[PDB]
Design a binder for this molecule. Structure first.
Ligand SMILES: Cc1ncc(COP(=O)(O)O)c([C@H]2N[C@@H](C(=O)O)CS2)c1O
Ligand SMILES: Cc1ncc(COP(=O)(O)O)c([C@H]2N[C@@H](C(=O)O)CS2)c1O
Ligand SMILES: [Cl-]
Ligand SMILES: [Cl-]
Lengths: 355, 355
């Protein structure tokens, strides 16, 4: 058999170089980087280079932290629950602005924060499929502990105006967090340019293993531990280190950024090829703006047949895709798709449509 | 060179069978078990068998959960912060009993809970190196939301009387949590026998990778998510699944229990051999009871030379060991140590002592 993966926004294949680099840490360099003897110390060089790759990736500065968590979900609950005790309870600032577009790791947590008595403004999405900096300017009250905006929508692929919100945040003296999970490796990430206080990411969406992630924390921003025990990660996030995956997420980030050109040029072109080919079949129109999107995602709607049905059929022909909201069809390429595969998908998709 | 690992309470070598079993999930079966197409579904059989091994390991029942977390540290912060909003704020029960022996993942979290205004009794350790069920009976107030006792001390290897505390907990209608991280694979774990509501473990202390763990939750016990977003693990712990490690921690648990005989018979004997050999050098006495210990740990004290010094020297001769508290020397075997290695260590240790 020969299959096509087009579900890259839902997880990605670990790059073989990432697998390769992690291996020795599943074999013989199995020591706990905390122990002072030969086994922990042996891991240090590889961990620090891994970390180096991570900072370089998002243009964090030496004086910032990039903390290894177990996923973006961890990262997200940490920023929110952390600013909860820092800013909400203990500085009175009882308001958060977020969006409705956000991943449930953000929304659901907010949901519960509201149940504790926080006020949360879920900024409403407009016709463009976007959020303007102005809306955040507006809802930004004074009780505002934190702004959270995703850098890129996981369903539509839509980029938001982070840099602007970053500025509005700076001027208004409020805390800014971006969930960047869908940006890393899709489009350049610059935290400095974004004046983000906090930035989340998950390895598996850029060819790293599932079950690791990062949170970028600024210069002198504080944030109560979500994992207390203060052993690791300069007190902020306790728990024995996931060495193999740190080393891998490191490689994975490096490679992700190194292919940024590639992603926009080749992958973006493949997504344009699929997209433009597919929309030349009756009543199938793309959801959201098409200009401020990451390269790899298209979200298409086949009016009359709900998407759940397209997926089932497509699966029988060895083509993996996912659901949207609008439900529509989420095709999401990666550096490993080929034009071969796209052509094929256009063919199989169209035939599946008509029948 | 030829090295000896005796630091098994600080991390362990992944068993080669565990590495082997995880591999295909780092290669080709890279899909997100949540997606409904061929890639997510493909992971289901291996995930469910992994889970099966996990329940079987700790004798959890079908109607209980065993939730995959990213480590015991995660597990521990979850039980405590979770009963905080369930029992502390929202049922008034503003008291927790724990011990002083507990891992910082427990203590440090409690510490912060106190800073929110909770009362925590840190049960004081007696001459035996233990805690009696009676003390928990005593401090168990009425405002008592939760009892937390480790099943086995990570420094001394000392087992606690879990089954009794379990009973006291049942009679007194209070919540019981055991951090079992040092029991799995050391001594039989039975949650039913322990009447624990909650049980924590970390894979890497029984030959599974670092960065995964479990929390056992009972029948109908509730516990607010520590990771909200309610996608995964029947709402309780959100975040894309760490497939490779779930599959591995599964194998690892299976193997851990299958060697329970071995651990007590052979490894326990090796630890007795080292222990009894070492204490026949002047003013070197074992810390804590010697009878209610897991098989693999000895904690020895060389009076006159602090332990930090023994470790450095020992490291130069390729023997990895860790610190205690008393600081003493924590030698911790595993199924992979050999008598060869123990003999050698007795020799090298004694020589290092005199000089
Ligand atoms: C009783 C007990 N509970 C929780 C942990 C933490 O597991 P971890 O979150 O993977 O680091 C540990 C860790 N103990 C550490 C040690 O003994 O150095 C390494 S494993 C532990 O012993
Ligand atoms: C914006 C955004 N933030 C956080 C997550 C969660 O990362 P995860 O904790 O590893 O599952 C995701 C996940 N989105 C999921 C999806 O699109 O199905 C899989 S990755 C995300 O898109
Ligand atoms: Cl918290
Ligand atoms: Cl919580």
């Amino acid at each position: 058999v020969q299959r096509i993966y087009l579900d890259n926004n839902a997880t990605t294949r670990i790059d073989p170089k990432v697998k390769e680099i992690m291996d020795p840490f599943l074999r013989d360099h199995y020591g706990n980087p905390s122990s002072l003897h030969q086994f922990g110390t042996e891991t240090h060089p590889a961990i620090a280079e891994a970390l180096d790759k991570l900072y370089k990736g998002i243009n964090a500065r030496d004086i910032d932290d990039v903390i290894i968590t177990s996923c973006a979900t961890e990262s997200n609950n940490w920023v929110l629950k952390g600013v909860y005790f820092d800013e909400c309870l203990k500085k009175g600032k009882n308001h958060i602005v977020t969006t409705v577009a956000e991943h449930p790791a953000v929304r659901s947590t907010c949901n519960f924060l509201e149940s504790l008595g926080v006020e949360v403004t879920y900024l409403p999405i407009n016709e463009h499929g976007s959020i303007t900096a102005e809306q955040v300017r507006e809802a930004i009250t004074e009780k505002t502990a934190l702004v959270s905006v995703m850098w890129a929508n996981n369903e539509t692929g839509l980029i938001f105006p982070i840099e602007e919100i970053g500025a509005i945040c700076k001027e208004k003296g409020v805390l800014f967090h971006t969930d960047a999970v869908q940006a890393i490796g899709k489009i350049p990430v610059d935290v400095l340019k974004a004046n983000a206080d906090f930035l989340s990411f998950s390895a598996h969406k850029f060819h790293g293993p599932k079950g690791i992630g990062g949170l970028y924390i600024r210069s002198g921003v504080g944030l109560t531990p979500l994992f207390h025990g203060g052993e690791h990660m300069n007190g902020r996030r306790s728990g024995t280190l996931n060495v193999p995956y740190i080393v891998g997420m490191g490689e994975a980030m490096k490679l992700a950024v190194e292919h940024l050109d590639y992603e926009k040029e080749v992958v973006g072109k493949l997504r344009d090829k699929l997209e433009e080919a597919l929309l030349k079949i009756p009543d199938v129109m793309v959801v959201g703006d098409r200009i401020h999107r990451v390269p790899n995602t298209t979200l298409v709607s086949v009016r009359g047949i709900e998407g759940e049905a397209m997926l089932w059929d497509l699966n029988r022909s060895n083509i993996a895709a996912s659901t949207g909201s609008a439900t529509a069809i989420r095709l999401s390429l990666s550096r490993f798709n080929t034009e071969a595969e796209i052509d094929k998908t256009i063919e199989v998709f169209s035939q599946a449509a008509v029948r």
